[PDB]
Design a protein around this ligand. Structure first.
Ligand SMILES: [Cl-]
Lengths: 7, 171, 171, 7
């Protein structure tokens, strides 16, 4: 999911 | 071997740091902290307090088995405010666990590593030769090398973007 | 009712638009598209090609049962590049399904709705009195009204930040 | 979780 864009 | 500690001034306010400042995971909600210019306000990142302008240093990182973590090094000038891409061009050089796959975070395409599992990783930073390298501790097998012409101070970097995983510095 | 279509030129590249340009969901990958100043490069947003300066206008939106959508209206000046807050202050007036619950997206705190399962929602925009209102189509029961002194062109707004939900214009 | 920040 798009959570990984906040890495 | 350098004894690093996590810098709570840099830490994204959703991150939960351990008391000895070795460990990090992601919390369910943002803490209310002083908004230092050095603090990552959007990306789920934290730096070590110690940075390196020259020489060669190494340390180790315990890693969770689940998705959501990334670690390696960052140049000091990595932008702290707003969403920054997690890429070499934006000042981050890291390994990542995502979708059960271990990655060297290259861009525009990440580089999948063949390693089946990781418990502990050695990061080796060498500003003399200009590279950062990762090794699995079990038998020091080489995982990946970024070659960087580093032109400013370089900080150990840690990122956890989901619950149920962690990173921890050793020693 | 106005006959609306999603503007491909505005769409976050991770969004997949349907052939008839009425339906929207979140894809697995960023598509290779022209980087128009109007394209949202970070937030998972798309506007309709038609925006409104004056008068009364309405349209219907079919909504997925799972978390991850928001829809309503946006002012033309809503920032397209970098991570924007999804708030009235940043030019978005919307309902949202998140955490198995329906919300009007006020800030700093969201406003809970009191409705059953939503399937289709009539959006009514009144640029004379300065309001956007949301109705459950089944029996046009009122869900929420934002009163706004709209001082520029207003565009129908759609956002999907999760795979496995969607929005779709009617008629 | 964090995916909603990209709304
Ligand atoms: Cl990739």
């Amino acid at each position: 999911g798009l959570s990984m864009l906040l890495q | 071997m350098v004894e690093l500690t996590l810098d709570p001034d840099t830490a994204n306010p959703r991150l939960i740091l351990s008391l000895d400042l070795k460990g990090v995971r992601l919390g369910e909600r943002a803490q209310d902290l002083p908004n230092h210019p050095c603090r990552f306000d959007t990306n789920t990142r934290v730096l070590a307090s110690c940075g390196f302008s020259s020489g060669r240093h190494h340390w180790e990182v315990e890693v969770g088995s689940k998705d959501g973590w990334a670690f390696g090094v960052a140049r000091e000038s990595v932008r702290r405010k707003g969403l920054t891409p997690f890429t070499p061009e934006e000042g981050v050089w890291a390994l990542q666990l995502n979708g059960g796959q271990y990655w060297a975070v290259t861009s525009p395409e990440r580089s999948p590593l063949s390693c089946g599992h990781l418990s502990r990783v050695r990061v080796a930073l060498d500003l003399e030769v200009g590279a950062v390298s990762f090794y699995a501790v079990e038998d020091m097998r080489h995982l990946y090398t970024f070659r960087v012409n580093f032109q400013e101070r370089v900080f150990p970097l840690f990122s956890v973007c989901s619950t149920g995983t962690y990173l921890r510095i050793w020693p």
